[PDB]
């Protein structure tokens, strides 16, 4: 008569690493590293992303005519730029503090596009019909949907002064541009004053702009430039535009709401009818495990990104069926 | 192992014990079979459950973390920002891989300890009424029926009750 003390074995082929020994086959184990994704862009906590299509941030804000227009009001959980954004700034020049604007838009949850300065009504005695071939649409020369190229009318450019009081109860994002012609002949033919200036003020913003005429190497077949500027007009505050030339005026502006947990990602994937708590540029992860090796960029509630190929904890025993 | 039992003086495990991590196999006249020691198995599960949950709990949820952009005159800021992303990633890759190795070592040793503790718990119950025939088994110097085997398993073995018969067979 005999009794024996022993331990469990089974048919598991799980392996784990330890300090003293690699590749130990064990009976029961737990994986801590998520490495799978679904290849799709998904809703995040029920809210769809803002997909910019053929545009980048700059092209959507300025109103590039090549990009399909969006509904006047959008809400989103994160913004998706495509890697091959061909449509952005179409008239060459510099977007000032562009990178800080992106960072601001990373915490915006919603916009409402609205006509801040109605076209035929805000700049009397000035031409508003200017277009260019650098910003073409359906072959024809066109212009930014959100801005307006004000030019001379009947051989004069009178000094203008317009202003907007923000009663939207949310920050308003105002964008404008400043044109720089390549020679003083075109400066006269367009704004009739060689010593033009533009002035833009709010309670807290204060900047003045001067034409800088010089020949420049052609970009998109243009020897002049157009710089672009922006400010966030606080609720109740007033923005005043004053100029006697060279101003690319605001026509449409954005009332903005703030949010949490949003972001901008660049992604090759497509939107699908799916929902997730965690989004990467490659696809959505479910978020039960503590680590993930799929992407360092994440939106939402996500595991922590690590370079590991394997993170497996043993729970059972050294498996010896011999 | 550190405690000599698993893969030690108990060379292998039992595919036949399907209801627990630690247990017993017996052989008497009424028959033979396996039975697992639930009290030690449930202790081990409780400890490893806590170990696994603590490993997950120390890792906070990772909220949104996306890149920034920089212009051509902000390289130093872009390199600092890259240094911060790489540095935190270096550290968390290291922390995760090391914590799992270190806990895997201790988890195997914890099992090895539990087996041996059970073996010594049985050995001290039987004393000289049986003999260690190696490999983690005991041979009784007396007849041990199912009721006797059950008394060893649940820690109530009656040493005097069989001491005489054992002394005789031991001679």
């Amino acid at each position: 008569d005999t009794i024996c003390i022993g331990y469990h074995a089974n048919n598991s082929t799980d392996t784990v690493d330890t300090v003293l020994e690699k590749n130990v086959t064990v009976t029961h184990s737990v994986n801590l590293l998520e490495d799978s994704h679904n290849g799709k862009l998904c809703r995040l906590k029920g809210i769809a992303p803002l997909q910019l299509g053929k545009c980048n941030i700059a092209g959507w804000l300025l109103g590039n005519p090549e990009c399909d227009p969006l509904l006047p009001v959008r809400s989103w959980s994160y913004i998706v730029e495509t890697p091959n954004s061909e449509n952005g700034i179409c008239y060459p020049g510099d977007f000032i503090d562009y990178e800080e604007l992106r960072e601001q838009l990373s915490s915006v949850s919603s916009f409402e596009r609205f006509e801040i300065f109605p076209k035929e009504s805000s700049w009397p005695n000035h031409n508003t019909n200017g277009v260019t071939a650098a910003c073409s649409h359906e072959g024809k020369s066109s212009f930014y949907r959100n801005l307006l190229w004000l030019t001379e009318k009947e051989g004069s450019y009178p000094k203008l002064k317009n202003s907007y009081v923000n009663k939207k109860g949310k920050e308003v994002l105002v964008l404008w541009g400043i044109h720089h012609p390549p020679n003083s002949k075109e400066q006269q033919n367009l704004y009739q004053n060689e010593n033009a200036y533009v002035s833009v003020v709010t309670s807290n913003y204060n900047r003045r702009f001067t034409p800088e005429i010089a020949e420049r190497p052609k970009v998109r077949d243009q020897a002049g430039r157009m710089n672009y500027y922006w400010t966030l007009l606080k609720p109740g505050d007033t923005i005043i535009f004053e100029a006697n030339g060279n101003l690319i005026a605001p026509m449409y502006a954005f009332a903005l709401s703030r949010g949490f947990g949003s972001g901008i990602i660049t992604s090759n994937a497509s939107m699908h009818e799916c929902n997730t708590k965690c989004q990467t540029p490659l696809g959505a992860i479910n978020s039960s495990l503590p680590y993930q090796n799929i992407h360092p960029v994440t939106i939402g509630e996500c595991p922590k990104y690590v370079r590991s190929a394997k993170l497996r904890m043993v729970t059972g025993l050294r498996n010896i069926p011999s | 192992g550190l405690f000599g039992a698993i893969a030690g003086f108990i060379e292998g495990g039992w595919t036949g014990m399907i209801d627990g991590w630690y247990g017993y196999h017996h052989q008497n006249e009424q028959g033979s079979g396996y039975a697992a020691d639930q009290k030690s198995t449930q202790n081990a599960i409780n400890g490893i459950t806590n170990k696994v949950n603590t490993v997950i709990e120390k890792m906070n949820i990772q909220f949104t973390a996306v890149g920034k952009e920089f212009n051509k005159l902000e390289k130093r800021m872009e390199n600092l920002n890259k240094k911060v992303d790489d540095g935190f990633l270096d550290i968390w890759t290291y922390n995760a891989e090391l914590l799992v190795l270190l806990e895997n070592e201790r988890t195997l040793d914890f099992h090895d300890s539990n087996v041996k503790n059970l073996y010594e718990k049985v050995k001290s119950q039987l004393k000289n009424n049986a003999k260690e025939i190696g490999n983690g088994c005991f041979e009784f110097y007396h007849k041990c029926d199912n009721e006797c085997m059950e008394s060893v398993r649940n820690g109530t073995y009656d040493y005097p009750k069989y001491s005489e018969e054992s002394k005789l067979n031991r001679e």
């Binding site: 029961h28 729970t315 | 627990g20 449930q42 459950t49």
Partner: peptide, 11 residues
């Protein structure tokens, strides 16, 4: 989390 490896384990 639970390690329910056998049904008699509890939750």
């Amino acid at each position: 989390x639970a390690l329910e490896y056998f049904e008699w384990l509890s939750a």
